[PDB]
Amino acid sequence: GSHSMRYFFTSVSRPGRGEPRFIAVGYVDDTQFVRFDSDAASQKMEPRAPWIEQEGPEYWDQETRNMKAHSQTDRANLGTLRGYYNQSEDGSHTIQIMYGCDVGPDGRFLRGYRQDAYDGKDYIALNEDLRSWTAADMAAQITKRKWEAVHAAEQRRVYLEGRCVDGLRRYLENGKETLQRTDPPKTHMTHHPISDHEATLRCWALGFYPAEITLTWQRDGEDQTQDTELVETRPAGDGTFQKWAAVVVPSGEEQRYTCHVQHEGLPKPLTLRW
């Protein structure tokens, strides 16, 4: 299947309370593999997946340099944006950045991304063509003009089509025993009387990977979409995911209902009946 690598960065100003908090995380697909935290003791990029630990000292040194540089740029940028917007020094502000690339099953480049936000709203984004920018407001237009003058877009494209792709490809091979696996959901149904005349049926999917899954309820074969409560997909804490769907049914009618579970790790979709 297709794969992705993403880095997510958050810097938050802390007026009166020292330097901004900087937190960086890297992902391959739904799996986190590196982190940097400015308040942590190491002051290094750190491994968060087994398969990255075998990268040598020069990898860790370089990634650490990259994080310090990102940190420092964000710090100056918090000041810059505060000036563009005429904001009070008293307020806490946030810069977030995401970038990364997607590859197909043959490792070929599908698309790249680079997007910046200020205080949780779009600020400036690289367009899909990897040659132009979308600025969200008048302040971001200043940045757009600057990044045009310094040919930032070409620099991003070089990264996104090159090292982003090369890195992801190496990671997918090195961590193939986990990144290229699919853990099918462990499924079961539970039953919870609400009264003598009603019960909840809950259809569970646990321990699955990757995160994408569909759970659907039927009554006599017909989808019950509107009546179905679906929780948001949630991390188990061990690298796998969880989800459930529930329906409220008339007591005595539980056996008319079925739950269908679809996941790429299943030989065939599963059907459950009380």
């Binding site: 340099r65 740029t73 944006l81 930032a152 890195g167």
Partner: peptide, 9 residues
């Protein structure tokens, strides 16, 4: 691997 390039706003 992260992008070594940073840019001021």
């Amino acid at each position: 691997e992260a992008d070594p390039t940073g840019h001021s706003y």
